[PDB]
Amino acid sequence: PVVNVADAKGTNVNDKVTASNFKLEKTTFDPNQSGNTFMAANFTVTDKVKSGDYFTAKLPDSLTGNGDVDYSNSNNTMPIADIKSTNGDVVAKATYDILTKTYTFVFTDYVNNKENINGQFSLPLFTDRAKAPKSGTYDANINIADEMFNNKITYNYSSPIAGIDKPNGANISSQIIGVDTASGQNTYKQTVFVNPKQRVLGNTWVYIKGYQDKIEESSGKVSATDTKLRIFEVNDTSKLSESYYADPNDSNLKEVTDQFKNRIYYEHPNVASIKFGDITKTYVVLVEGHYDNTGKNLKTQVIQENVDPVTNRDYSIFGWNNENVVRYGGGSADGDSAV
């Protein structure tokens, strides 16, 4: 069904581009607390190039260019600030391919009959919650125009394992690891860890709220129509990530969603209630919800409540907050050509 694709286009000119003066803002941070970094580099075009010629930058397993901003509803492509000339003309158009973690800078006409083309650029960088699942240090070697710039980044993820300091106190945690702020659909992906302490909890209930204290302060929309939940039993809690990334097809997870057919209730506005009952294992709840158009930050709160299995007393409750900005500067407009 056709032939080669290797982005042939106006041909790759990484062989005519030299990156230098590579800098990283910081090499240690906590992605669970808005922690992220930045990169900057200089680049000079060593030979004559044309409009349509392009050079690239590739990210290693440990990094992503989009972070918690989901672009799956945008062809899995992330728009990037272009490199501009003093006049303001675009010297090159920038785009980030989520799948190949590759940045593509395509030169415009400005490059036609020009020499000594020299400049610089900086880009935001984040953790790859899926490939850097645990806290620790990773190689973060970056490739710019077929040149390597070695780095080492340390991720100190705030631990997902948290709760009341009591032998069998309530304990739950969460993190919104995906927010679509560009497509217009306004979706978000959130991972919830119920009982990551692996304690024995009686008559436990979990609440996933689309707000924290004031419903009007959050854009979150949690309802039977706006929210989709999938529940999994964790076999080995220590194999559970600290970045909250959780693949529904993970072998360490046993999906028990069906068993919860009638254990999920939408009793109160913007609140999904889950009846877990007596449990001893850790559970993962994969949330796929939406937020409104008020532009308010997406604020969520997960609560876990329970009593002692044996005495049905010794009540305990624990809560965890989440908050992601939904802001997406710019605008969108579309019209139809006249008949």
Strands 253-255 and 228-234: antiparallel
C-alpha dihedral over 191, 196, 201, 203, to 10 degrees? 0
Q: Is residue 335 at the binding interface for a copy of itself, with CB under 8 A as the rule?
A: yes
**Stretch of 90-98, 119-127, 197-205, 327-335 contacting Mg ion, by CB under 5 A:** 197-205
Decide the pairing of beta strands 187-194 and 54-58: unpaired
Q: Which of 78, 83, 222, 253 binds a copy of itself (CB under 8 A)?
A: 83
Q: Kindly state whether residue 234 participates in binding Mg ion, applying the rule CB under 5 A.
A: no
Q: Does 225 bind a copy of itself (CB under 8 A)?
A: no
Q: Please identify which residue in 45, 106, 179, 240 interacts with a copy of itself, judged by CB under 8 A.
A: 45
Contact between 176 and Mg ion by CB under 5 A: the answer reads no
Q: Does residue number 33 form part of the binding site for a copy of itself (CB under 8 A)?
A: no
* Cβ–Cβ < 8 Å for 14, 146: yes
Closest-approach residue to Mg ion (CB): 280
Helix (H, G, I), strand (E, B) or coil at 34: coil
Among positions 290-329, residues that touch a copy of itself (CB under 8 A) are 293-296, 327-329
Tokens 């969603």 identify what position?
257
Amino acid found at 333: A
The burial of 135, by beta-carbon neighbours within 10 Å (0-12 exposed, 13-18 middle, 19 or more buried), is given as middle
Rg (CA), the chain: 24
- Of 9, 15, 34, 40, the residue at the interface with a copy of itself (CB under 8 A) is 40
Kindly tell me which of 300 and 306 has the beta carbon lying closer to a copy of itself: 300
* Candidate list 2, 262, 267, 331; residue touching a copy of itself; CB under 8 A: 331
Edge-to-edge order in the sheet of strand 271-279: 264-265, 271-279, 201-209, 298-307, 316-324
Among 35, 52, 124, 319, the residue binding a copy of itself under the rule CB under 8 A is 124
Instruction: Name the site residues for a copy of itself (rule: CB under 8 A).
Output: 23-26, 38, 40, 43, 45, 79-86, 88, 91-92, 94, 110-111, 113-124, 293-296, 327-338
